[PDB]
Structure 1
Amino acid sequence: TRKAVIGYYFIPTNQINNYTETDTSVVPFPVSNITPAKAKQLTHINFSFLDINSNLECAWDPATNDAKARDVVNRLTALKAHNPSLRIMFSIGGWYYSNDLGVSHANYVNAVKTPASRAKFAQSCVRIMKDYGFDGVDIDWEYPQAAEVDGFIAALQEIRTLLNQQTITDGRQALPYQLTIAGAGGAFFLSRYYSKLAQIVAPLDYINLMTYDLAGPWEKVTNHQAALFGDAAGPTFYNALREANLGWSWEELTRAFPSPFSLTVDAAVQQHLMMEGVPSAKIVMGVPFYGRAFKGVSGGNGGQYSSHSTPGEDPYPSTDYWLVGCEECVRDKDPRIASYRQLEQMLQGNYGYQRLWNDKTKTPYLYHAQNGLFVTYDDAESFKYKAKYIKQQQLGGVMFWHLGQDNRNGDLLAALDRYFNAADYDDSQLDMGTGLRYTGVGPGNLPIMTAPAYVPGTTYAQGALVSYQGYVWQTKWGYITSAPGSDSAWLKVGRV
């Protein structure tokens, strides 16, 4: 099955309203930059962003020029002429609109509140999809909290029911309308709905993990924002999942959630696979097409794992654009984020940056010895390991933010496509390294095991293994006289 390659196409309202493909000073990344070759390398483009308004319906930004918007969307759907499997999804939400303190947060919370609000909301999603010509619905609420989860689930189920009906009504059996969400790629946010992951994922074609931004100026120590595996020399974190509303025992929580742990892409993927009913094929690994920059770092480890003096606030609370050589940073008044495109230019420019590689995390980073700068980003090299991991772990594919940050030749996108599909690319010998793997074990990833059948009336010592009701169980203490499942002295440790 072809791996999904989902790229976000984000365009601010002001750019839509002034849309042009001949002046990058107004629209830096027009749809025409998505050449036929690039359209063939994508399976999905997530058009973004739409929102949920006070009327609790899916809708464009009020300031949007509709004829302009439709024309932009039509240019994107026209790309399908180059790739019959291509889908132009539209995404609702994103951090700005939907974070707890975001301008539209209330609408997300209220829209999923009742059977009626959900019905109205779900209907608007499908209506918007059909009217503008999109191929699916993607919801990026960052993120529903514990009490809002059931409503969120019910809303996704409603959208799924309606989409499946629309696919039949439109004869799209060959390319069904889809439903996806951008899910948390770190344990802290994931813990909000983690306990109901199976229900959240059931109505979806894919759950696209934002397995990046795992480091940022809000953190005291600089770190890789998307390390595939862990580096013991880097910071470790409190494992928030052991505090999720799971209802599991101390032993169960502890073995599934070691704490502290390395916040990596592998951690997030494994944490999802630990839950039963969460199929690997629906998990999509997100990767960033931009780097995060920090200033005020010291030496010793190339800028890694150092204290820093980078403002964490949004908007950038200053006019000091200190990321040397970063022109886009001045355009965007923020030296803390730089697109791969810009980073590549900074490296070939003799600005003082040294590209280094951490072979445990399997990611690159820049260090500016003279000015004390550190940049954590991804490139075609780090993508080799992520792509192999996606294949080895049987994941659904890759998602990335965002298309306008790839270089002009579309090299990052082309690398991902190459790793999955080129007949002449062979990663059978690519060494995945010794970086730390997430070792938690949960109900969803129990190892296959064998054990004598449990015998009613038998007394077992501590550590005894038996098979019962399809699983292998082990005693937590001694003199066990009851059966697995009826006696809380037994820990389920294997399956089959």
Structure 2
Amino acid sequence: AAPGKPTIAWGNTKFAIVEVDQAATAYNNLVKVKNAADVSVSWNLWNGDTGTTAKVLLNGKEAWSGPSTGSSGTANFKVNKGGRYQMQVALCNADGCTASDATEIVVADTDGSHLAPLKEPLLEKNKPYKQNSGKVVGSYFVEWGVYGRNFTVDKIPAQNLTHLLYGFIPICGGNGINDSLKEIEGSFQALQRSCQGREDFKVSIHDPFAALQKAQKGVTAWDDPYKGNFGQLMALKQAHPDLKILPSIGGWTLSDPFFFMGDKVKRDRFVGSVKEFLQTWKFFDGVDIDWEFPGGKGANPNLGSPQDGETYVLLMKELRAMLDQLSVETGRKYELTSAISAGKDKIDKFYSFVNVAQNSMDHIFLMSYDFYGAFDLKNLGHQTALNAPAWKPDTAYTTVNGVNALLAQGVKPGKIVVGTAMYGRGWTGVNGYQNNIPFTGTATGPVKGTWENGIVDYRQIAGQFMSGEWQYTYDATAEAPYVFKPSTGDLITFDDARSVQAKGKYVLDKQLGGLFSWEIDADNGDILNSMNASLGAADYNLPIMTAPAYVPGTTYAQGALVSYQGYVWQTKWGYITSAPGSDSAWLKVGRVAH
């Protein structure tokens, strides 16, 4: 008859097509891409005929066959597609095959095919919306927000986004190549660590720990290959497969290397390293280029050339060609996007190049914000307004001026995605102002910020600065709110649900492409809610315990027990710096004796 039923032996059941080293600090030592995972299974049949053939099956489909040589066996075989499989062993002879009970294996891959959907409840004021607008609704998630800002991927209101942008993927290079990074403590050094033994002008990951290694919800375990932001983004992709997740190369302090890419040798190296990046990290859907800025006047006062416009056009063409080739190899569609200045000097000269490059690009992210801020204590104004204010109708830097200038140069309007701000910029000691318009005065310094000087999370504006000592006024001509504390001259300019709605309605009239925002962590929900609504979407007992007092600033290992606000808490995973209750990493386990 058919052989007896074999029993799979206890063994490892977690495997990876792309491996990640968890202690690695350099990108070259961090990830190894394989064609398949090497899977192994052992089994026994302690009594009976062991048959002449052994088979391994994954979800019933045969993965391996070999001779059955006794009451014990091992098989090694390759799995080239990620997922969770039900593995069985079958012993066979001429009378048939007898299969084992299923043992489940996990084969990891950077598309997330091994992960359950990260489908998280909406937090704070976020409301559910149905993506029928047809427009872009995008936001930026910062790699480093998982620390002080305490904002991880599981907190993203992903269902209300069409695009999620990941800031920022860096370009390798030391002195002369990333000098701007030196203005941030430890940031330049962190990039050198990451690029050890890696060619300059290749992309890397700025913070491998935050991106891949730090335990986060749903990706907590030492032998979970992808943790941190990449792992969660992969799970998120499982939950929202139409969400476009783009890596964003550049930004304010990581833009310097673009200025060297007039050299095609360097540019080809960069473009290739990007193709490799998207091949290593399959959950990404394309690339966003945030060169601040072609021609100069970014962070670095020594960088900028008129050659840069041409260089920008070439970079976008070559990237498009790369993604086209990559689409051939993988069958997938890829998006190429860029964020461009909404208004500086000679932006009209740059916009002509945008007109040439627009057919390489799916969307243009118009950075219609940072028009004013603590970087100018003498000329105050609305940092992200739609129009000019009554008191200065000739204000150069407004959303509408940026959009008109682009259109004037022949940029198709459907490409144009208008920027909204989830932060305010602000000043202190505003004085010498007429008509109770604080913007007509001058300032003595930056407003005290949430994390850095002169910049305030919208959540803190709404939470703390809209009342009491503060006056909340909406400029219906500019379409721009501000709050003002006359006792101290504190003045903050920002976006709110009303001004966001003005932008969204404007987008609908002018047939522009949608809205995007910076940065998702700083919203309380009102901004993203208004972004969706205005673009057309519509609505949808514990045991007494004892434990040391939680100490802010302490980094806790898994299983720590702290007392905090009358309860005893427990970290569900490691590397926790947040206060208990502020995220899903703490578990309420006890009461403190009152």
Name the TM-score, length of structure 1 as normaliser. Answer: 0.67
Quick one: percent identity of the two aligned structures?
A: 31
2:291 is the alignment partner of 1:141: yes
What's the secondary structure of 1:52's corresponding residue? coil
- CA separation in 2, counterparts of 1:417 and 1:384? 9
Shift of 1:289: 0.4
Q: Which runs of 5+ in 2 are unaligned?
A: 1-132, 174-199, 215-225, 296-305, 541-594
Report what 1:355 is aligned to: 472
Report what 1:229 is aligned to: 387
Match 1:68 to one of 203, 208, 213: 213
Match 1:337 to one of 455, 458, 468: 455
Report what 1:11 is aligned to: 143
Report what 1:448 is aligned to: none
Q: Structure with the greater relative contact order (CA < 8 A, sep ≥ 6): 1 or 2?
A: 1
Deviations 1:307-359 (A, max 9, x none): 11125xxxxxxxxxx64xxxxx36x252x110110111113663x00100111
Change (3 A) 1:128 1:201: same
CA contact (8 A) 1:303 1:373 kept: no
2:557 is the alignment partner of 1:412: no
- CA separation in 1, counterparts of 2:251 and 2:346? 14
Structure showing greater Rg: 2
- CA separation in 2, counterparts of 1:214 and 1:333? 18
Report what 1:33 is aligned to: 155
Match 1:167 to one of 321, 327, 347: 327
Change (3 A) 1:262 1:110: closer
Match 2:313 to one of 153, 156, 159: 153
- CA separation in 2, counterparts of 1:367 and 1:405? 20
* Aligned-partner residue type, residue 401 of structure 2: A
Q: Which runs of 5+ in 1 are unaligned?
A: 20-24, 99-104, 237-260, 312-321, 324-328, 426-496
Match 2:169 to one of 4, 29, 50: 50
Higher helix proportion, which one? Answer: 1
- CA separation in 1, counterparts of 2:207 and 2:239? 32
What pairs with 1:359-438 in structure 2 (closer than 5 Å)? Answer: 359-407=476-524, 410-423=525-538
- CA separation in 2, counterparts of 1:398 and 1:282? 11
Report what 2:245 is aligned to: 88
Change (3 A) 1:223 1:158: same
- CA separation in 1, counterparts of 2:243 and 2:211? 24
What's the secondary structure of 2:474's corresponding residue? strand
CA contact (8 A) 2:246 2:288 kept: yes
Report what 2:441 is aligned to: 306
Name the TM-score, length of structure 2 as normaliser. Answer: 0.57
Change (3 A) 1:59 1:111: farther
Deviations 1:65-98 (A, max 9, x none): 6632752112123223333320110001101222
Report what 1:124 is aligned to: 273
Deviations 1:185-232 (A, max 9, x none): 114262462332212322111110110011122332211001101124
Deviations 1:138-164 (A, max 9, x none): 011111222122222112111101112
Higher strand proportion, which one? Answer: 2
- CA separation in 2, counterparts of 1:223 and 1:27? 27
Deviations 1:384-432 (A, max 9, x none): 110000111111111110000101xx2211221122233479xxxxxxx
Change (3 A) 1:348 1:127: same
Shift of 1:383: 1.1
What's the secondary structure of 1:5's corresponding residue? strand
CA contact (8 A) 2:313 2:354 kept: no
- CA separation in 2, counterparts of 1:370 and 1:302? 15
* Aligned-partner residue type, residue 425 of structure 2: R
CA contact (8 A) 1:221 1:235 kept: no
What's the secondary structure of 2:372's corresponding residue? coil
What's the secondary structure of 1:304's corresponding residue? helix
Deviations 1:428-468 (A, max 9, x none): xxxxxxxxxxxxxxxxxxxxxxxxxxxxxxxxxxxxxxxxx
What's the secondary structure of 2:483's corresponding residue? strand
Shift of 1:293: 1.1
CA contact (8 A) 1:368 1:374 kept: yes
2:335 is the alignment partner of 1:178: yes
Report what 2:94 is aligned to: none
Q: CA RMSD for the aligned pairs? A: 2.3
CA contact (8 A) 1:57 1:120 kept: yes
Change (3 A) 1:333 1:288: closer
CA contact (8 A) 1:5 1:398 kept: yes
CA contact (8 A) 2:348 2:405 kept: no
Change (3 A) 1:353 1:213: same
